Amino acid sequence: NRIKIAPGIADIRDKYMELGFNYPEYNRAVKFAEESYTYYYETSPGEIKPKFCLIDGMSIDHCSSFIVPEFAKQYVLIHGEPCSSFKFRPGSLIYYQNEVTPEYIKDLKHATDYIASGQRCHFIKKDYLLGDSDSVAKCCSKTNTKHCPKIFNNNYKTEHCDDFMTGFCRNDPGNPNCLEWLRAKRKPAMSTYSDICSKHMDARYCSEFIRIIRPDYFTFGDTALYVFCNDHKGNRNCWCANYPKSNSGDKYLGPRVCWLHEC
Amino acid sequence: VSVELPKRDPPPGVPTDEMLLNVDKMHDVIAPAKLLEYVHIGPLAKDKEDKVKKRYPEFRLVNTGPGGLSALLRQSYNGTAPNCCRTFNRTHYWKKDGKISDKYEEGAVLESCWPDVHDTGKCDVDLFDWCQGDTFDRNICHQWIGSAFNRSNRTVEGQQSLINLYNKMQTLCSKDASVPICESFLHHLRA
């Protein structure tokens, strides 16, 4: 009985809950904090800890009601310190100060159902999060990188985009993104372009691929050339690697390449 | 307590990107995950977490956040040598019903092998046997030999495997150099 709430000398989000009971010394106070600001920064370096004490058995969705959606695109919710909140004020953080102690909270919960336990809201900053293959396609292809994690948008310095780009670059091997993925010089990129160039060795991106691989990984180009020059044996450009003479196909291989000044 | 307790209505919660993550559509995100890297999959139930544990035996389910907010953490690469040492493009494959595929269908199990597995030296023992006889594919064997000549030896197993591969290749070519694999060995030695 005689329930009241009064703001304190601190900020408006923190208040005092006052009980005036018939017993003279139950006319006491409890400092409780309820949040009313939408965060756009960090309470502590590298983390956001709104004063919303998420009680057990309650939806976690409400814990994000206190953060701007733009700012929350790259924050993940983790377990926080144990806390207690009034059932009639779901999420009113209770400060364990002075006579307020968890044992007193348990005694009050046993006496009456005006108290529940839970954990403090705790958001940590890691990176943006992807949720489907369409966002992966957007990030790796670099068509739309407004919200893309570092691992998937780092200019192909890690092999996270290898699997997508392997199939993506067979459709358009002349894409600047595909060539800059090839320039990382990993085995999937070089093998994908070896398969691409074994059929389209007479295209500009295959000239650039040959310029990229050689001399470190010439073995990924030579093989491709071989295939091309065994399929297009009538091509006038495969007449140095694959001489048109039926018996003499390796006529100008190795140092003999200089016996024909056209090669 | 005669006085009715004033009841504050909880503010309407707005979900984040993290809490709107469905593990069923994240097969293109979880698969390329590296070691000791977390991949959050949003809220998860018990049947769903069992399903995720079965579909991703190489990962561990870590309850990062309340309400079942879980993340997958890669622990090891379970890719076998015959499946992914015979090609450079394939990085991971879905195995199910006793068959291997590169396309995801329900009930499959992910199997990923190490990045640049050839550079580590695990594929040498397999491709040495696979590149002799009728099972000789010119592209894969030639590219394997060429990348074995230009190999960045990082771990001790790398040097050990490279030395064993050179010794075995030298012995086999001393036996006979007319076979295609010894022809490629001689060509890359010349190069």
CSV table of C-alpha atoms in Angstrom, one decimal:
chain,number,residue,atom,x,y,z
A,1,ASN,CA,0.0,0.0,0.0
A,2,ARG,CA,0.9,3.7,-0.5
A,3,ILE,CA,2.8,2.9,-3.7
A,4,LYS,CA,4.6,5.9,-5.3
A,5,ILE,CA,7.4,6.7,-7.8
A,6,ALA,CA,9.6,9.8,-7.7
A,7,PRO,CA,12.4,10.9,-10.0
A,8,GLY,CA,15.8,11.4,-8.4
A,9,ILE,CA,18.6,13.9,-8.7
A,10,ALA,CA,20.1,11.7,-11.4
A,11,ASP,CA,18.9,11.4,-15.0
A,12,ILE,CA,15.2,11.0,-15.7
A,13,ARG,CA,15.5,7.3,-16.6
A,14,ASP,CA,16.4,6.4,-13.0
A,15,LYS,CA,13.7,6.8,-10.3
A,16,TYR,CA,12.9,5.8,-6.7
A,17,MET,CA,10.0,3.4,-5.9
A,18,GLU,CA,8.6,4.3,-2.5
A,19,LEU,CA,6.6,1.9,-0.2
A,20,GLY,CA,4.7,3.4,2.7
A,21,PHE,CA,3.5,0.5,4.8
A,22,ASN,CA,1.7,0.2,8.1
A,23,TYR,CA,4.9,-1.1,9.6
A,24,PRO,CA,7.0,2.1,10.2
A,25,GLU,CA,10.3,0.7,8.8
A,26,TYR,CA,8.8,-0.7,5.6
A,27,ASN,CA,8.4,2.9,4.5
A,28,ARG,CA,11.4,2.5,2.3
A,29,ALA,CA,12.9,3.2,-1.2
A,30,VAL,CA,14.3,1.2,-4.1
A,31,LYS,CA,16.3,2.7,-6.8
A,32,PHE,CA,15.1,1.4,-10.1
A,33,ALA,CA,16.2,2.2,-13.7
A,34,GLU,CA,14.0,1.9,-16.7
A,35,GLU,CA,15.3,3.0,-20.1
A,36,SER,CA,13.5,5.5,-22.4
A,37,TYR,CA,16.3,6.4,-24.9
A,38,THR,CA,16.9,4.9,-28.3
A,39,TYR,CA,20.7,4.3,-28.3
A,40,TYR,CA,22.8,5.4,-31.2
A,41,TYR,CA,26.2,5.0,-29.5
A,42,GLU,CA,28.0,2.7,-27.0
A,43,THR,CA,27.4,2.8,-23.3
A,44,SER,CA,30.9,1.2,-22.8
A,45,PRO,CA,33.8,0.9,-25.3
A,46,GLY,CA,32.7,-1.8,-27.8
A,47,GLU,CA,29.4,-2.7,-26.3
A,48,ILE,CA,25.8,-1.4,-25.6
A,49,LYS,CA,24.2,-2.3,-22.3
A,50,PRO,CA,20.7,-0.8,-22.0
A,51,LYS,CA,19.2,-0.8,-18.5
A,52,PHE,CA,16.4,-3.2,-19.7
A,53,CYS,CA,16.5,-6.2,-17.4
A,54,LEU,CA,15.1,-8.9,-19.6
A,55,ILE,CA,13.2,-11.3,-17.3
A,56,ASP,CA,13.2,-15.0,-17.8
A,57,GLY,CA,10.5,-16.4,-20.1
A,58,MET,CA,10.2,-13.1,-21.8
A,59,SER,CA,10.7,-12.5,-25.6
A,60,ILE,CA,14.2,-11.2,-26.4
A,61,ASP,CA,12.6,-8.9,-29.1
A,62,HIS,CA,11.8,-6.2,-26.5
A,63,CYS,CA,15.5,-6.1,-25.5
A,64,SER,CA,16.2,-4.5,-28.9
A,65,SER,CA,13.4,-1.9,-28.5
A,66,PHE,CA,16.1,0.5,-27.1
A,67,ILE,CA,18.4,0.6,-30.1
A,68,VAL,CA,18.1,2.4,-33.4
A,69,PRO,CA,17.5,-0.3,-36.2
A,70,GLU,CA,20.3,1.2,-38.3
A,71,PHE,CA,22.8,1.0,-35.4
A,72,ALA,CA,21.7,-2.6,-34.5
A,73,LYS,CA,22.4,-4.1,-37.9
A,74,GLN,CA,25.9,-5.2,-36.6
A,75,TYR,CA,25.3,-6.0,-32.9
A,76,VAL,CA,24.6,-9.4,-31.3
A,77,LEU,CA,22.8,-10.1,-28.0
A,78,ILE,CA,24.7,-12.1,-25.4
A,79,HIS,CA,24.0,-13.2,-21.8
A,80,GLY,CA,24.3,-10.4,-19.2
A,81,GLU,CA,24.6,-10.2,-15.5
A,82,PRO,CA,21.7,-11.6,-13.4
A,83,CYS,CA,19.1,-9.0,-12.4
A,84,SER,CA,15.7,-8.7,-10.9
A,85,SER,CA,12.6,-6.8,-12.1
A,86,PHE,CA,9.1,-6.2,-10.9
A,87,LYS,CA,6.5,-8.3,-12.7
A,88,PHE,CA,4.1,-5.3,-12.9
A,89,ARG,CA,7.1,-3.3,-14.4
A,90,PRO,CA,8.6,-5.8,-16.8
A,91,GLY,CA,12.2,-4.8,-17.3
A,92,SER,CA,12.6,-2.2,-14.5
A,93,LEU,CA,16.2,-2.9,-13.4
A,94,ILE,CA,16.7,-3.2,-9.7
A,95,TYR,CA,19.9,-1.9,-8.2
A,96,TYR,CA,21.5,-4.2,-5.6
A,97,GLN,CA,22.5,-1.3,-3.3
A,98,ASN,CA,22.3,-0.9,0.5
A,99,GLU,CA,19.7,-3.2,1.9
A,100,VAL,CA,18.8,-4.4,-1.6
A,101,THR,CA,20.4,-7.9,-2.0
A,102,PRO,CA,19.5,-10.9,-4.1
A,103,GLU,CA,18.5,-12.8,-1.0
A,104,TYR,CA,16.0,-10.1,-0.1
A,105,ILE,CA,14.8,-10.2,-3.7
A,106,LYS,CA,14.2,-14.0,-3.4
A,107,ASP,CA,12.4,-13.5,0.0
A,108,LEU,CA,10.1,-10.9,-1.6
A,109,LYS,CA,9.4,-13.2,-4.6
A,110,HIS,CA,8.5,-16.0,-2.2
A,111,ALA,CA,6.3,-13.7,-0.2
A,112,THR,CA,4.5,-12.2,-3.2
A,113,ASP,CA,4.5,-12.5,-7.0
A,114,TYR,CA,5.7,-9.0,-7.7
A,115,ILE,CA,9.3,-10.0,-8.6
A,116,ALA,CA,11.0,-12.0,-11.4
A,117,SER,CA,14.6,-12.8,-12.3
A,118,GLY,CA,16.4,-12.5,-15.5
A,119,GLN,CA,19.5,-11.2,-17.2
A,120,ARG,CA,20.7,-7.7,-18.1
A,121,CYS,CA,20.5,-6.7,-21.8
A,122,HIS,CA,24.0,-7.0,-23.3
A,123,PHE,CA,24.8,-6.2,-26.9
A,124,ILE,CA,28.3,-6.8,-28.3
A,125,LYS,CA,29.8,-5.5,-31.5
A,126,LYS,CA,31.2,-8.0,-33.9
A,127,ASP,CA,30.3,-7.2,-37.6
A,128,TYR,CA,27.4,-7.3,-40.0
A,129,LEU,CA,25.4,-10.5,-40.3
A,130,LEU,CA,24.2,-12.2,-43.4
A,131,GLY,CA,21.1,-14.4,-43.5
A,132,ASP,CA,20.6,-15.8,-47.0
A,133,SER,CA,22.4,-16.6,-50.3
A,134,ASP,CA,21.0,-13.4,-51.9
A,135,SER,CA,22.9,-11.2,-49.5
A,136,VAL,CA,26.1,-13.3,-50.1
A,137,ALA,CA,25.7,-12.8,-53.8
A,138,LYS,CA,25.3,-9.1,-53.3
A,139,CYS,CA,28.3,-8.8,-51.1
A,140,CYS,CA,30.7,-11.1,-53.0
A,141,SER,CA,29.8,-9.7,-56.4
A,142,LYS,CA,30.3,-6.2,-55.0
A,143,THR,CA,27.1,-4.9,-56.6
A,144,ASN,CA,25.6,-3.7,-53.3
A,145,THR,CA,28.0,-3.6,-50.3
A,146,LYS,CA,26.1,-1.1,-48.0
A,147,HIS,CA,25.7,-3.8,-45.3
A,148,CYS,CA,28.3,-6.5,-45.8
A,149,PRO,CA,30.7,-8.0,-43.3
A,150,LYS,CA,34.4,-7.6,-43.5
A,151,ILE,CA,34.9,-11.3,-44.2
A,152,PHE,CA,32.7,-11.2,-47.3
A,153,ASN,CA,33.7,-7.6,-48.3
A,154,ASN,CA,37.5,-7.4,-48.0
A,155,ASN,CA,38.5,-7.2,-51.7
A,156,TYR,CA,39.0,-11.0,-52.0
A,157,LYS,CA,41.8,-11.2,-49.5
A,158,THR,CA,40.1,-14.2,-47.9
A,159,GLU,CA,38.6,-17.3,-49.4
A,160,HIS,CA,35.0,-16.6,-48.1
A,161,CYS,CA,33.9,-15.6,-51.6
A,162,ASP,CA,35.6,-18.4,-53.4
A,163,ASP,CA,32.6,-20.7,-53.7
A,164,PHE,CA,30.2,-18.1,-55.0
A,165,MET,CA,32.7,-16.4,-57.3
A,166,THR,CA,33.6,-19.8,-58.8
A,167,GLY,CA,30.1,-20.1,-60.4
A,168,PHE,CA,29.5,-16.4,-60.7
A,169,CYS,CA,32.5,-15.7,-62.9
A,170,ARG,CA,31.8,-18.5,-65.4
A,171,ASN,CA,28.9,-16.4,-66.7
A,172,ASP,CA,30.9,-13.2,-67.1
A,173,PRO,CA,34.7,-13.8,-67.0
A,174,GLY,CA,35.4,-10.3,-68.1
A,175,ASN,CA,34.0,-8.7,-64.9
A,176,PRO,CA,36.5,-6.5,-63.1
A,177,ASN,CA,35.5,-8.1,-59.8
A,178,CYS,CA,36.2,-11.6,-61.3
A,179,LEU,CA,39.6,-10.5,-62.6
A,180,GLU,CA,40.5,-8.9,-59.2
A,181,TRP,CA,39.4,-12.1,-57.5
A,182,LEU,CA,41.7,-14.0,-59.9
A,183,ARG,CA,44.5,-11.6,-59.0
A,184,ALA,CA,44.4,-13.0,-55.5
A,185,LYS,CA,46.1,-16.1,-57.0
A,186,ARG,CA,44.3,-18.8,-55.1
A,187,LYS,CA,43.7,-22.3,-56.5
A,188,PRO,CA,39.9,-22.0,-57.0
A,189,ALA,CA,40.3,-18.8,-59.0
A,190,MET,CA,43.1,-20.1,-61.2
A,191,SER,CA,41.3,-23.4,-61.8
A,192,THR,CA,38.0,-21.7,-62.6
A,193,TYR,CA,39.7,-19.5,-65.2
A,194,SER,CA,41.7,-22.4,-66.5
A,195,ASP,CA,38.3,-24.1,-67.2
A,196,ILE,CA,37.0,-20.9,-68.7
A,197,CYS,CA,40.0,-20.3,-70.9
A,198,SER,CA,40.2,-23.9,-72.2
A,199,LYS,CA,37.2,-22.8,-74.4
A,200,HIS,CA,37.6,-19.1,-74.7
A,201,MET,CA,41.3,-18.7,-75.0
A,202,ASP,CA,40.7,-16.1,-77.8
A,203,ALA,CA,39.2,-13.6,-75.4
A,204,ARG,CA,40.8,-10.6,-73.7
A,205,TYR,CA,40.2,-11.8,-70.2
A,206,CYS,CA,42.2,-14.9,-71.0
A,207,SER,CA,45.1,-12.7,-72.1
A,208,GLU,CA,44.8,-11.0,-68.7
A,209,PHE,CA,44.6,-14.4,-66.9
A,210,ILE,CA,47.8,-15.5,-68.6
A,211,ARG,CA,49.4,-12.3,-67.6
A,212,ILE,CA,48.3,-12.8,-64.0
A,213,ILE,CA,49.3,-16.5,-63.5
A,214,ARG,CA,52.7,-16.5,-65.2
A,215,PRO,CA,55.4,-17.3,-64.2
A,216,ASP,CA,54.3,-18.6,-60.8
A,217,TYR,CA,51.3,-20.8,-61.8
A,218,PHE,CA,51.9,-21.2,-65.6
A,219,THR,CA,50.6,-24.8,-65.2
A,220,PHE,CA,47.0,-23.5,-65.0
A,221,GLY,CA,47.4,-21.7,-68.3
A,222,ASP,CA,49.3,-24.2,-70.3
A,223,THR,CA,46.8,-27.0,-69.7
A,224,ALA,CA,44.0,-24.6,-70.8
A,225,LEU,CA,45.9,-23.7,-73.9
A,226,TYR,CA,46.4,-27.4,-74.7
A,227,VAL,CA,42.7,-28.1,-74.5
A,228,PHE,CA,41.8,-25.1,-76.7
A,229,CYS,CA,44.5,-26.0,-79.2
A,230,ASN,CA,43.2,-29.5,-79.5
A,231,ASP,CA,39.7,-28.4,-80.0
A,232,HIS,CA,40.4,-25.5,-82.3
A,233,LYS,CA,43.2,-27.2,-84.3
A,234,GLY,CA,42.1,-25.0,-87.3
A,235,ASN,CA,42.8,-21.8,-85.4
A,236,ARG,CA,45.7,-20.0,-86.9
A,237,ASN,CA,46.8,-18.9,-83.4
A,238,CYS,CA,47.3,-22.5,-82.2
A,239,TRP,CA,49.7,-23.2,-85.0
A,240,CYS,CA,52.8,-22.6,-82.8
A,241,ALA,CA,51.6,-24.8,-79.9
A,242,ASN,CA,49.9,-27.3,-82.2
A,243,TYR,CA,51.5,-27.4,-85.6
A,244,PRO,CA,49.0,-28.3,-88.4
A,245,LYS,CA,51.2,-31.1,-89.6
A,246,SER,CA,49.7,-34.4,-88.7
A,247,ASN,CA,52.9,-36.2,-87.5
A,248,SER,CA,54.6,-33.1,-86.2
A,249,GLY,CA,52.5,-31.4,-83.6
A,250,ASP,CA,55.3,-30.7,-81.2
A,251,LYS,CA,57.5,-29.3,-84.0
A,252,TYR,CA,58.1,-25.9,-82.4
A,253,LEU,CA,58.0,-26.8,-78.7
A,254,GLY,CA,60.7,-25.6,-76.3
A,255,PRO,CA,63.8,-23.9,-77.7
A,256,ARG,CA,62.6,-24.8,-81.2
A,257,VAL,CA,60.0,-22.0,-80.9
A,258,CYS,CA,62.6,-19.7,-82.3
A,259,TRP,CA,63.0,-21.7,-85.5
A,260,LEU,CA,59.8,-20.1,-86.6
A,261,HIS,CA,60.1,-16.3,-86.4
A,262,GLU,CA,56.3,-15.8,-86.5
A,263,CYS,CA,55.9,-17.6,-83.1
B,1,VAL,CA,-1.5,-5.0,-0.8
B,2,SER,CA,-4.8,-3.1,-1.1
B,3,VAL,CA,-3.4,-0.5,-3.6
B,4,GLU,CA,-3.3,-1.8,-7.2
B,5,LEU,CA,0.3,-1.8,-8.4
B,6,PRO,CA,0.9,0.5,-11.4
B,7,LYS,CA,1.7,-1.6,-14.4
B,8,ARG,CA,4.1,-0.2,-17.0
B,9,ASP,CA,3.5,-1.6,-20.4
B,10,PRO,CA,6.8,-2.9,-21.9
B,11,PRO,CA,7.9,-0.9,-25.0
B,12,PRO,CA,7.1,-2.6,-28.4
B,13,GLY,CA,10.3,-4.5,-29.3
B,14,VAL,CA,11.8,-4.3,-32.8
B,15,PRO,CA,13.8,-7.3,-34.0
B,16,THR,CA,17.4,-7.0,-35.2
B,17,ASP,CA,19.1,-8.7,-38.2
B,18,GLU,CA,20.6,-11.2,-35.7
B,19,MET,CA,17.2,-12.3,-34.4
B,20,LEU,CA,15.7,-12.7,-37.9
B,21,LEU,CA,18.3,-15.3,-39.1
B,22,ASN,CA,17.0,-18.6,-40.3
B,23,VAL,CA,19.6,-21.4,-40.3
B,24,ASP,CA,17.8,-23.1,-43.2
B,25,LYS,CA,18.8,-20.3,-45.6
B,26,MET,CA,22.3,-19.9,-44.3
B,27,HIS,CA,24.0,-22.8,-46.1
B,28,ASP,CA,26.0,-20.3,-48.3
B,29,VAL,CA,27.2,-18.5,-45.1
B,30,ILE,CA,28.0,-21.3,-42.8
B,31,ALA,CA,29.9,-23.4,-45.4
B,32,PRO,CA,32.7,-20.9,-46.2
B,33,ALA,CA,33.3,-20.2,-42.5
B,34,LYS,CA,36.9,-20.6,-41.3
B,35,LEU,CA,38.2,-22.1,-38.1
B,36,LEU,CA,37.6,-20.3,-34.8
B,37,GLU,CA,35.1,-18.0,-36.6
B,38,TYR,CA,31.6,-17.6,-35.2
B,39,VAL,CA,28.5,-17.7,-37.5
B,40,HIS,CA,25.4,-16.6,-35.7
B,41,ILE,CA,22.2,-18.3,-36.8
B,42,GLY,CA,19.6,-16.4,-34.8
B,43,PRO,CA,17.0,-18.1,-32.5
B,44,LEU,CA,16.9,-21.9,-32.5
B,45,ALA,CA,14.7,-24.6,-31.1
B,46,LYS,CA,15.6,-28.0,-29.8
B,47,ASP,CA,14.6,-30.0,-32.9
B,48,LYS,CA,16.2,-27.3,-35.1
B,49,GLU,CA,19.4,-27.4,-33.2
B,50,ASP,CA,19.5,-31.2,-33.5
B,51,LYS,CA,19.0,-30.8,-37.2
B,52,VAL,CA,21.8,-28.2,-37.4
B,53,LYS,CA,24.1,-30.5,-35.5
B,54,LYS,CA,23.4,-33.3,-37.9
B,55,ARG,CA,23.7,-31.2,-41.0
B,56,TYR,CA,27.0,-29.5,-39.8
B,57,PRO,CA,29.0,-32.2,-37.9
B,58,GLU,CA,32.1,-30.1,-38.4
B,59,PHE,CA,30.7,-27.2,-36.3
B,60,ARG,CA,29.7,-26.6,-32.7
B,61,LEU,CA,26.5,-25.0,-31.5
B,62,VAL,CA,27.3,-22.3,-28.9
B,63,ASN,CA,24.4,-20.6,-27.1
B,64,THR,CA,25.7,-17.0,-27.4
B,65,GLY,CA,22.4,-15.2,-26.5
B,66,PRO,CA,19.2,-15.8,-24.7
B,67,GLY,CA,16.1,-17.1,-26.4
B,68,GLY,CA,18.1,-19.7,-28.2
B,69,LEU,CA,20.4,-17.3,-30.0
B,70,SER,CA,23.1,-19.8,-31.2
B,71,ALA,CA,26.2,-19.6,-33.3
B,72,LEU,CA,28.2,-22.2,-35.3
B,73,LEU,CA,31.9,-22.5,-34.7
B,74,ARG,CA,34.0,-24.6,-37.2
B,75,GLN,CA,36.1,-27.2,-35.4
B,76,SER,CA,37.7,-29.4,-38.1
B,77,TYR,CA,37.6,-30.1,-41.8
B,78,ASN,CA,36.1,-33.5,-42.5
B,79,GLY,CA,36.7,-33.6,-46.3
B,80,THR,CA,38.1,-36.9,-47.5
B,81,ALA,CA,41.0,-37.0,-49.9
B,82,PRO,CA,39.3,-38.9,-52.8
B,83,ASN,CA,36.4,-36.4,-52.9
B,84,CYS,CA,38.2,-33.1,-53.0
B,85,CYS,CA,41.9,-33.8,-53.9
B,86,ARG,CA,40.9,-34.5,-57.6
B,87,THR,CA,39.7,-31.0,-58.2
B,88,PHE,CA,40.7,-27.4,-57.3
B,89,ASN,CA,37.4,-25.7,-57.8
B,90,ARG,CA,35.4,-27.7,-55.2
B,91,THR,CA,35.8,-26.5,-51.6
B,92,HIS,CA,33.0,-28.3,-49.9
B,93,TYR,CA,30.4,-30.9,-50.9
B,94,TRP,CA,27.1,-32.1,-49.6
B,95,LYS,CA,27.0,-35.9,-49.0
B,96,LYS,CA,23.7,-37.8,-48.6
B,97,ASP,CA,22.2,-41.1,-49.6
B,98,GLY,CA,25.7,-42.3,-50.2
B,99,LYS,CA,26.3,-39.8,-53.0
B,100,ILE,CA,28.3,-36.5,-53.3
B,101,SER,CA,26.9,-33.3,-54.8
B,102,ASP,CA,27.7,-29.6,-55.0
B,103,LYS,CA,24.0,-28.6,-54.7
B,104,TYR,CA,22.1,-28.4,-51.4
B,105,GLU,CA,19.0,-30.4,-50.9
B,106,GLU,CA,17.3,-31.2,-47.6
B,107,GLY,CA,18.8,-33.9,-45.5
B,108,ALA,CA,22.4,-33.4,-46.8
B,109,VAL,CA,25.5,-33.3,-44.7
B,110,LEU,CA,28.2,-30.7,-45.3
B,111,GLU,CA,31.8,-31.9,-45.8
B,112,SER,CA,34.5,-29.3,-46.2
B,113,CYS,CA,38.2,-29.9,-46.7
B,114,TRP,CA,41.1,-27.6,-45.9
B,115,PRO,CA,41.7,-24.4,-48.0
B,116,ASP,CA,44.5,-24.9,-50.4
B,117,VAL,CA,44.5,-28.6,-49.4
B,118,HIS,CA,47.1,-29.3,-52.1
B,119,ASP,CA,49.6,-26.8,-50.6
B,120,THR,CA,49.4,-28.7,-47.3
B,121,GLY,CA,50.6,-32.0,-48.9
B,122,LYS,CA,47.6,-34.2,-48.1
B,123,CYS,CA,46.7,-34.7,-51.8
B,124,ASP,CA,50.1,-36.0,-52.8
B,125,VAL,CA,49.6,-39.6,-51.6
B,126,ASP,CA,46.2,-39.8,-53.3
B,127,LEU,CA,47.1,-38.1,-56.6
B,128,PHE,CA,50.3,-40.1,-56.9
B,129,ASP,CA,48.2,-43.3,-57.2
B,130,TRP,CA,45.3,-41.6,-59.1
B,131,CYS,CA,47.6,-40.1,-61.8
B,132,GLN,CA,49.0,-43.5,-63.0
B,133,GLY,CA,46.9,-45.6,-65.4
B,134,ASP,CA,43.6,-45.1,-67.0
B,135,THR,CA,42.5,-42.8,-64.2
B,136,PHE,CA,45.0,-40.1,-65.4
B,137,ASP,CA,43.3,-36.8,-66.0
B,138,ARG,CA,45.8,-34.5,-67.8
B,139,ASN,CA,44.4,-31.2,-66.4
B,140,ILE,CA,44.3,-32.2,-62.7
B,141,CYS,CA,47.5,-34.1,-62.7
B,142,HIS,CA,49.4,-31.4,-64.6
B,143,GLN,CA,48.1,-28.7,-62.4
B,144,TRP,CA,48.9,-30.7,-59.3
B,145,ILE,CA,52.5,-31.3,-60.4
B,146,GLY,CA,52.9,-27.6,-61.4
B,147,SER,CA,51.6,-26.3,-58.1
B,148,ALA,CA,53.7,-28.9,-56.3
B,149,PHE,CA,56.8,-27.4,-57.9
B,150,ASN,CA,55.8,-23.9,-56.8
B,151,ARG,CA,54.6,-24.7,-53.2
B,152,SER,CA,54.9,-22.4,-50.2
B,153,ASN,CA,56.0,-24.9,-47.5
B,154,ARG,CA,54.6,-23.6,-44.2
B,155,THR,CA,54.4,-26.7,-42.0
B,156,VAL,CA,56.9,-29.5,-41.4
B,157,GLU,CA,54.4,-31.9,-43.0
B,158,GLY,CA,54.7,-29.7,-46.1
B,159,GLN,CA,58.4,-30.3,-46.6
B,160,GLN,CA,58.1,-34.0,-45.6
B,161,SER,CA,55.3,-34.6,-48.2
B,162,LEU,CA,57.2,-32.7,-50.9
B,163,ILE,CA,60.4,-34.7,-50.3
B,164,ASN,CA,58.4,-37.9,-50.4
B,165,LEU,CA,56.6,-36.9,-53.6
B,166,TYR,CA,59.9,-36.0,-55.3
B,167,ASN,CA,61.5,-39.2,-54.3
B,168,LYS,CA,58.6,-41.3,-55.5
B,169,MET,CA,58.3,-39.4,-58.7
B,170,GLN,CA,62.1,-39.8,-59.4
B,171,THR,CA,61.9,-43.6,-58.7
B,172,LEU,CA,58.8,-44.0,-60.9
B,173,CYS,CA,60.4,-42.0,-63.7
B,174,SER,CA,63.6,-44.0,-63.4
B,175,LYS,CA,61.4,-47.1,-63.9
B,176,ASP,CA,59.9,-45.6,-67.0
B,177,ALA,CA,59.6,-42.0,-68.3
B,178,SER,CA,57.3,-42.7,-71.2
B,179,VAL,CA,54.2,-42.6,-69.0
B,180,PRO,CA,52.3,-39.3,-69.1
B,181,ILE,CA,52.9,-38.4,-65.4
B,182,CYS,CA,56.6,-38.8,-65.8
B,183,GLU,CA,56.4,-36.7,-69.0
B,184,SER,CA,54.7,-33.9,-67.0
B,185,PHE,CA,57.3,-34.4,-64.3
B,186,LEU,CA,60.2,-33.9,-66.8
B,187,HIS,CA,58.4,-31.0,-68.4
B,188,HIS,CA,58.0,-29.2,-65.1
B,189,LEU,CA,61.5,-30.0,-64.0
B,190,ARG,CA,62.7,-28.4,-67.3
B,191,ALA,CA,60.4,-25.4,-66.6
